[PDB]
Amino acid sequence: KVYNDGYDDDNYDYIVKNGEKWMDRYEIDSLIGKGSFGQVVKAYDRVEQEWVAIKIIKNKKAFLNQAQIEVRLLELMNKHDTEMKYYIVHLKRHFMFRNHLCLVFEMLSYNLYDLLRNTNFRGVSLNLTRKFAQQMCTALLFLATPELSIIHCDLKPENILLCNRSAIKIVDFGSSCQLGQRIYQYIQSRFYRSPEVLLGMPYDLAIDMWSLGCILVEMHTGEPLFSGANEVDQMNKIVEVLGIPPAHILDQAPKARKFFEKLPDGTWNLKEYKPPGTRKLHNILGVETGGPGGRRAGESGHTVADYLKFKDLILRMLDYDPKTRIQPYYALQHSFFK
Numbered sequence: 001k002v003y004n005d006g007y008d009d010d011n012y013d014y015i016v017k018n019g020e021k022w023m024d025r026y027e028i029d030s031l032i033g034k035g036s037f038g039q040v041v042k043a044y045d046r047v048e049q050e051w052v053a054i055k056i057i058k059n060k061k062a063f064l065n066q067a068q069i070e071v072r073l074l075e076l077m078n079k080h081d082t083e084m085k086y087y088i089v090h091l092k093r094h095f096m097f098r099n100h101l102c103l104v105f106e107m108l109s110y111n112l113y114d115l116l117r118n119t120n121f122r123g124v125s126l127n128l129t130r131k132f133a134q135q136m137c138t139a140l141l142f143l144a145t146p147e148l149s150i151i152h153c154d155l156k157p158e159n160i161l162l163c164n165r166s167a168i169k170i171v172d173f174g175s176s177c178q179l180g181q182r183i184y185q186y187i188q189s190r191f192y193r194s195p196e197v198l199l200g201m202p203y204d205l206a207i208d209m210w211s212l213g214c215i216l217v218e219m220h221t222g223e224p225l226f227s228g229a230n231e232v233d234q235m236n237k238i239v240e241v242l243g244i245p246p247a248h249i250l251d252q253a254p255k256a257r258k259f260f261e262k263l264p265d266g267t268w269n270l271k272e273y274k275p276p277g278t279r280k281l282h283n284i285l286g287v288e289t290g291g292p293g294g295r296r297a298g299e300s301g302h303t304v305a306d307y308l309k310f311k312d313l314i315l316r317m318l319d320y321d322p323k324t325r326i327q328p329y330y331a332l333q334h335s336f337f338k
């Protein structure tokens with residue numbers, strides 16, 4: 001049984017051969033990753049004389065079409081004249097090779113999850129968190145450009161890469177869409193899933209900001225803020241920290257009744273967790289006790305006043321109301337950055 005004249009396995013993936021030379025241009029070094037879309041190889045480009053990351057899309061129509069959307073979005077972002085652009089991974093070019101769409105990107109380093117592992121899941125300092133936070137708010141401002149309006153739809157530590165410097169770039173626009181395009185109900189990775197998506201509600205660019213808030217707390221503590229085992233557990237861990245969501249949201253939510261019940265007086269409550277709003281971010285961060293674990297007492301940039309400013313920024317990111325949740329332009333104005 002032969003797939004694609006022998007070039008593919010039985011899973012529509014190109015069979016990666018170490019040292020293969022494509023088109024008298026690319027020298028394939030190695031496989032550096034597998035995903036649903038296909039694979040990523042490290043390769044040397046002879047024309048440009050540099051190492052690149054080549055995303056090899058599966059030879060299967062469902063995956064080709066998804067990647068054509070991904071290419072269209074990266075090419076749109078590329079056409080834009082800003083320095084904000086460079087917080088997104090740069091698509092250099094694309095080609096077909098043996099019936100596979102290949103995307104050529106700049107070679108980046110490891111992701112923010114890898115970083116956290118290398119902290120033994122104790123987190124990075126508030127200062128590094130702040131630099132990560134600023135770049136990420138800047139990236140989200142760029143995506144919020146009226147002509148782009150890209151919702152990422154899957155922000156998480158493993159989709160933010162180090163270049164090598166604490167320079168970082170967003171990757172994986174493979175779940176992404178533009179505002180005004182229709183609804184998909186099961187989106188975002190579970191720990192980073194906005195309450196509107198949990199509630200089956202219409203969403204916009206604010207879902208990215210919600211993920212961002214979850215991310216930043218994680219980068220500093222070492223662990224996920226809301227580590228849900230499923231959707232019910234997820235909404236419940238949100239409610240522990242942030243309380244019961246506004247009545248105007250729940251009165252309207254196609255999936256309100258999955259997590260909440262309307263009590264006889266018309267108020268909402270959950271259907272054993274800490275009571276709504278009782279696991280305070282204030283404590284998770286250790287605002288007054290020398291940061292998380294107490295591991296940052298007296299370190300510069302880690303005063304009680306610094307932590308309060310950080311706590312304030314996150315809670316604006318974790319606002320239940322997507323209309324009022326902090327937006328990228330103003331997140332950059334916040335005193336955490338000043």
Ligand SMILES: C=C(c1ccc2c(c1)CC(C)(C)c1c(N)ncnc1-2)C1CCNCC1
Pocket residue numbers: 032033034035039040053054055089105106107108109158171172
């Ligand atoms: C196959 C994956 C993957 C591996 C490496 C990279 C990417 C994705 C993204 C890009 C292509 C941007 C890139 C880059 N530019 N430089 C270096 N490595 C990468 C995985 C990661 C974990 N989740 C499943 C998919």
